[PDB]
Design a protein around this ligand. Structure first.
Ligand SMILES: Nc1ccn([C@@H]2O[C@H](COP(=O)(O)OP(=O)(O)OP(=O)(O)O)[C@@H](O)C2(F)F)c(=O)n1
Ligand SMILES: Nc1ccn([C@@H]2O[C@H](COP(=O)(O)OP(=O)(O)OP(=O)(O)O)[C@@H](O)C2(F)F)c(=O)n1
Ligand SMILES: Nc1ccn([C@@H]2O[C@H](COP(=O)(O)OP(=O)(O)OP(=O)(O)O)[C@@H](O)C2(F)F)c(=O)n1
Ligand code: NA
Ligand code: NA
Ligand code: NA
Lengths: 535, 535, 535
């Protein structure tokens, strides 16, 4: 049984929600019992997003195998239960890096190395590597058709369609159908022009996904069909929705999955979207409303905390609570004080690097601890929680991380190599990425929530809890809730004289989904609801 | 059984021989017992070529039904036995004229008349009119893909393909694969770029006909296939050939007809190209060689006399004579004299309008008559022969046509409505177009050549033989060999004291084919051979 | 005074002679006293041609500074006296390698690295780096407009034109104007379509260079001007020529350099092409004809020996001898013997790597030595000359290079590190690239020819003459003619019991020009003429 490919392209504009559309379609196909996966081809030159700023790119998503990937793989894992790996995301940078190394080494045997066939072959190889052994592979092409950056990807998939054959390949193209106030009509002209552009590259689209701020009526869909060599039933309306969880239903409603199953000769039962219907229901029917403050340094781009924002949303679903997420610049806490943290039912400090706004986060963790306001700290959120406690409870003056103040007396957070005590005494592979097992301390808040002794979560951090200064903070009342490895590194801390205070080193947001939620975020949003009642 | 359409387009350059290629492919399909026709879509604004100079776009071809058409319909009739009519040729001018007519009187009922759907509908309607009731319809699109003028034709046939279905429609695209001396290789890049241009208008070609001055090798055909979404077997080499009669064989040897019959699900036997093999054999195995002078006013563009040139070649085939056609400017006969008519084994004066170079043709007819050199006069060629005899034998000094000298004493050639005698006395559907019956005189040369009392030949002329001055020329020894209609108009004249001197009003070149030849031209070339032997 | 840029692009096909056209125009501009340079932007992914096979790419050209570059820089140095360096040639591979290293390091400070601005900025930087400090910079863009591979280069130079301003930038675009036999006309349609393609990328061409097998007449140039927004005087005909040395004259004849000087506001005297007129004259008026055999392993692509073929041509100019260059596969000498070396007035064995066909070259050097046939050996040509002599005169059985037979008893050629004697005894930065001074032995044939004690030539070789086995070959009659460095490496050898036998380690072909010739190649072709007389 041959692997089938759906090549997903975008026209007219970016910000179409190509990832969500691909993820939603994969959700439908998975709900028909098909083995489905998705991969993201990014046209940027970065070898991977490891070097990309949260404020410019958005969050670096981390897979089980510890790959640093586009945040779209977050969308993928939140819509299908197939696990993403390094094989599900690559950049132009990776491809050119691959080919350059093969070339300098001498693997091409004196050949002229060319965009075709050498760059295109490298792209095709990685697509087959990620795709083979599945029923359907959705291959999302980053960039916009008509731009320079995506042309090698478009040429590569054109070749793949011919080689594999059109019996097992489809081209799905997203376009913008914008509304004009003047005439009160949605416009098909950009779709007409975008399809000609895609054809000029050698690709006849099979399916058109028409993005608009409203439903694309039958007349406009018929016009698109007429001009684009596409049957009317293969022209799909995908309007702006109040919830992305509705998109699987909207696509199924227009028979998109039936068309795909027919084209690929797949006999599978009707999509059971009951789990998505349940999610849509939960979201539309909240009993309470809470305001949770996310206090961090990358707030000028919310996508910097994409998976965190979505994990809070999933916590809301499982408690039937509407979570009003307030983004509060941690630097504003330094400037204007803890008055901007007033009127919050809970507080979350997410991950980050660099000292800018960290003193604000330390002040925020203090305010949360002293006023019994529910707190969740992720990576840097655990660091500022340990610093706050060490500094203000265990009386370790100016206790900090070596990342921020390298020569500080009390480096409560530092690299395993840098570990020292207050007198400068020492003991007799630095970056941690991906899935690692963590042992939960018995009778701990997290042990209850996770409802198991051992959990698996994903790391992306360099700086650890200094084990040499740990005992002095433990004696001062702080509780180690979780540990991992032969080195017994601190994964989770708690403040037990508090309604809900948890802080973890790993990124729990990367394992949270709308359907299965997350124990930690469920507990956090519950505690936020309970706090809101007591006022 | 549904009618099948092959849309024949050209890329890179014009002058690819789109007509000869379509005609040659039609010849193969006809040899497999298929009911095949061809039609030409011309992007020029002329409502028809009736108002076009011969030196402009070539000869005006005339069908049986008296349609003035593109010379390509000459190629069609010389390659298939299916007769051409008005509905096998239309222009942009014709389409716009019909739509404007319908619009001005109010057929469109207050609608905005647009390129789509109104112009494209009109194009499709005329394609179905000429096509339906055949197995395979070849639709030649004039102009080059990428130009403005052919876009409405290309959009129209794109729509037809979708409507009729790809089960019964193919796109056959000719390109130039030019040779570069610098590198000693033929170049596929223009084909690559032309196919992207054709795709950008919404048409994926199914077959590529690669024109070059030599065979397009396997490597180049594979490269074209790789880049153009076309299977290797549908990439056809059409090199420059010494004889166009070989082209059906070249295309068949690459399985083009097999691919078409498979795609259209037509169960028909292998093509028997015996009739074309015979024509090729005749042409390659001549016994004698003759030089025939064609003395006219349009020699600067040979295609002005396309059908006449081919008729002479068909004459050669039937006699196993190799005909060297020497094009001689009739104005050079006026200036330099009969010196340039020496060394000719026969003389042909073809049709034309306007007085420029006519006196040279009259001088030429005289030279051919007085020196007993075989003479064939067509339309104007007959006028100048009558003028010659009237002026130099019947002693009617300054005898001319009213076309050239309206106020001449002896208008031996004039419109029926101008007919007057030498004293200015008179007697008591001006334009004659298409097939008309002609009665042949019992003791005439043509009666024995045609071997029938009545014949059918095609007219395109206004100015007739003046019947009022005819009997005076008849008494001077001129034979009337043929007449027609109620008004007994002179169709053929002969000089009986001469080896071979014939001149007709009609265009015998339009019914001459390479396979069936033509009685008159067969006779004329025989006389040219006989004259050559006697010298 | 601002540096002016002429961006030279190609359309329709490659193999237009973009390099020759750019080089020829630079020659004219240099002849007006302007400081002119040229650079080649190659779209291949190879970081440089160092790793490219001669049989696939052609020769690796070597500049003074020891850069391995496209053979086009050979054309540049043979048309202008400005010296080429690493700065005058770079690939897509170099640009992507630059950007990837900056990115991984962290030079982009967390930015998304994109084709625009990061790849385009890298291209612009290298163009400015090679261009600045000249009056006019010709920037040759490799690939064909309309292809994927050159788009980053085209976008980069589009930006440069806007930034620098159109007062100091011109776009010069080459196209093919092919001849069609059928109509007997050259076709402007590909030029029309190529200019639209270039405009679609954001570039309005200022100058059109029309390549054809004949002159492009005024009517066709006027048609190109009409459709392309280019004045008729900026549409240049560049027909196929029997000599590339004529091209400067043909371009000046059409005022190309006047237009450029006007557009860039350069007041400079009329181009003095006297040196080119002298070269054209010399070439057109040979007194003798010689047949020189070039016996090597890369003969299936003559461009593998591009600069060698041209150096022989320049030798012909300086002696007024027509050099008939016969390419003889050295492997055919192994198969069919020295019978295929019969009827040669001289023999040249050029550079190469690998053992394939080397035994044929050793046999060829023997035949040349024994029969007193003039011999020139370049790099591998010196190796096979030293091997032949050592093996057949000094009686060193199976004497070879360590490159070919690593464990041979007499490694007469080997790396400086590998150097051993016949008993395996040894003495108590391997690749040599670019200009190195060489000391010529007094009373040597080369000392006479070069007419100086010290010469500067360019190296590209790993394997040296083994100094430990040298004395035994010297005693056997062989003469060291040139040496270099502190290690006193053998640069040139001679056989003094021979009319003309020279072999050098360096590549003299890279310093040979049509105007100034080359002492060594002048001497070689002279000796070939003298040998031809004695028969
Ligand atoms: N390839 C094409 C397609 C169409 N048109 C012409 O496009 C014209 C209609 O222009 P509109 O109303 O702006 O476009 P719409 O298609 O209705 O798309 P929208 O949904 O954005 O309104 C017709 O005259 C035409 F003639 F149909 C054209 O000239 N060439
Ligand atoms: N769509 C395309 C197609 C090709 N190429 C690039 O085109 C380059 C080859 O250039 P050539 O030799 O002039 O083209 P050819 O295809 O061999 O066609 P011809 O038969 O006319 O010679 C490759 O580096 C490439 F990379 F393959 C490209 O960049 N984009
Ligand atoms: N952008 C354009 C340009 C031209 N044409 C149409 O192109 C037609 C002429 O077609 P040809 O004779 O093949 O082209 P040529 O320009 O003479 O170029 P060549 O030198 O290759 O012969 C006109 O009817 C037209 F109308 F002028 C067009 O439709 N759109
Ligand atoms: Na509209
Ligand atoms: Na090529
Ligand atoms: Na033309």
């Amino acid at each position: 049984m041959t692997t089938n490919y759906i090549f997903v392209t975008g026209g007219v504009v970016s910000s179409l929600g190509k990832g969500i559309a691909a993820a939603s379609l994969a959700a439908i196909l998975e709900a028909r019992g098909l083995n489905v996966t998705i991969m993201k081809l990014d046209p940027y030159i970065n070898v991977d997003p490891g070097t990309m700023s949260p404020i410019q790119h958005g969050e670096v998503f981390v897979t089980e195998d510890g790959a640093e990937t586009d945040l779209d793989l977050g969308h993928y894992e939140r819509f299908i239960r197939t696990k993403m790996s390094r094989r599900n995301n690559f950049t132009t940078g990776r491809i050119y890096s691959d080919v350059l190394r093969k070339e300098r080494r001498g693997d091409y045997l004196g050949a002229t190395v060319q965009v075709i066939p050498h760059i295109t072959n490298a792209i095709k190889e990685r697509v087959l590597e990620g795709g083979e052994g599945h029923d359907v592979v959705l291959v999302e092409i980053g960039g916009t058709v008509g731009d320079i950056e995506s042309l090698p990807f478009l040429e590569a998939i054109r070749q793949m369609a011919v080689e594999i054959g059109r019996e097992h390949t489809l081209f799905m193209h997203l376009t913008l159908v914008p509304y004009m106030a003047a005439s009160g009509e949605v416009k098909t002209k950009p779709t007409q022009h975008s399809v000609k552009e895609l054809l000029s590259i050698g690709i006849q689209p099979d399916i058109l996904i028409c993005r608009s701020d409203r439903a694309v009526p039958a007349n406009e869909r018929a016009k698109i069909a007429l001009f684009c060599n596409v049957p009317e039933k293969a022209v799909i309306s995908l309007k702006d929705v109040d919830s992305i969880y509705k998109i699987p239903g909207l696509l199924k409603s227009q028979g998109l999955d039936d068309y795909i199953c027919k084209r690929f000769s797949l006999n599978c039962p009707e999509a059971n979207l009951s789990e998505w219907e349940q999610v849509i229901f939960e979201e539309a029917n909240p009993v309470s409303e809470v305001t949770i403050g996310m206090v961090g340094k990358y707030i000028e781009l919310p996508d910097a905390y994409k998976s965190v924002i979505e994990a809070l949303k999933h916590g809301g679903l499982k408690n039937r609570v509407s979570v009003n997420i307030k983004l509060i610049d941690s630097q504003d806490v330094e400037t204007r004080g803890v008055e901007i943290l007033k009127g919050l039912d809970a507080i979350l400090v997410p991950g980050g690097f660099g000292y800018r706004g960290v003193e604000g986060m330390i002040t925020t963790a203090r305010f949360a601890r002293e006023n019994n306001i529910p707190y969740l700290g992720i990576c840097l959120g655990m660091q500022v929680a340990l610093i706050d406690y060490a500094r203000h409870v265990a009386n370790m003056e100016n206790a900090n991380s070596t990342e921020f103040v390298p020569d500080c007396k009390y480096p409560v957070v530092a690299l395993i190599t840098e570990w020292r005590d207050e007198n400068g005494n020492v003991e007799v592979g630095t970056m941690r990425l991906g899935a690692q097992q963590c042992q939960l301390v018995d009778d701990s808040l997290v042990r209850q929530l996770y409802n198991a002794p051992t959990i698996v979560e994903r790391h992306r951090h360099r700086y650890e809890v200094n084990n040499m200064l740990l005992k002095q903070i433990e004696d001062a009342g702080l509780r180690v809730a979780g540990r991992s490895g032969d080195d017994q590194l601190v994964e989770i801390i708690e403040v037990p004289n508090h309604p809900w205070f948890v802080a973890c080193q790993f990124h729990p947001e990367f394992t949270s989904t709308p359907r299965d939620g997350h124990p930690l975020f469920a507990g956090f949003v519950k505690a936020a609801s309970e706090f809101q009642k007591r006022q």
